[PDB]
Symmetry: C2
Subunit: 204 residues, 2 copies
Amino acid sequence: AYTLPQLPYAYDALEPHIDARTMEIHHTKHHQTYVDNANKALEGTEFADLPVEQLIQQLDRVPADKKGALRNNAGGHANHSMFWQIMGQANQPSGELLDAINSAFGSFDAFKQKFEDAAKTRFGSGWAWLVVKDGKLDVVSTANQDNPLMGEAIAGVSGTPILGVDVWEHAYYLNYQNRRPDYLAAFWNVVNWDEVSKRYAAAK
Amino acid sequence: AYTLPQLPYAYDALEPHIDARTMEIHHTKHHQTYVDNANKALEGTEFADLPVEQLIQQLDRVPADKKGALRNNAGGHANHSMFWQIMGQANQPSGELLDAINSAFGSFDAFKQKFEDAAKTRFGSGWAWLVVKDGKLDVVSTANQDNPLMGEAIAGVSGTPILGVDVWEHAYYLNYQNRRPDYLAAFWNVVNWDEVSKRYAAAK
Ligand SMILES: [Mn+2]
Ligand SMILES: [Mn+2]
């Protein structure tokens, strides 16, 4: 019941910041694998009809033998699905999103630093996120394919994510090798703040 | 305290199974970073002089605030140090190690399938290991830089590792990209079974 989404842009649209080969393998190999394995785990359950963002808020009610596979693979599908949409071909937010950033973090610059720190500090595989929690913004990180929508019990953090960065080594190894900070610096050039703004509006 | 060990062979000695560029980055960048961060954590403590494989067996004795840094960083140093030594330039074990493999797994071919399965199913970053536990061989995996020497409470598995394979994406992405199974198949060509036999003798 899940399918791989098409990207909103061509595989080379984000060069030189994110290389075309990475975009192609990340989408057509990594993300495809999560969709396929999530579908396998959903076979013959009552959950095969739920949108993926709703399924991952309900992991405590799936059968115990399928919890891990669904956490990992539905999590992977939800996470990559959002990631493609929040990127696009002095890039900064505006309007009420900028105001909420100023309020929570002091400035856009201070926000970038907190976000990069969270991404750099995540040991092994995972993601860093900007989330809305009780109408306020915060920066959290998760392991592997965990997503703050899963809740504190599972993911260790909570909130509705409106922006995320993938720091699995597959997201940056071909262009940046070990240099995660360089990848994070380039990432700011490709964030679609219009899309993040839309997500913020719908999260409060 | 700790220092980065010299490799027992040139960076290009394992071609074409593992590429020279990866060997260089894996050693001088990734492994160096674990050494540096472990040294920072161990400064001016009674623990700074212990061999690393002894330290990771005693993580319960260290100050509570240093446990996390040492698990990740002394773990990474211990893991990579062993990794370089168990590779060298069809390849299979002999003698009493081969007999032990036959006894525990049925055959060397059956052991390879079990080891590859453990390494394939480790989600995210980690390692797969052949361990000796109560005189018998078994195959286990660990997350991130955990090592079975840390014990079941920390690593979730136990035993003395005699062979391990790194399945962090940095270990294989440049040459294999998403194809972790092709990397594992290549890895059999570079195992130094004489060294593994040595470790088996010491651990039994
Ligand atoms: Mn990814
Ligand atoms: Mn490694």
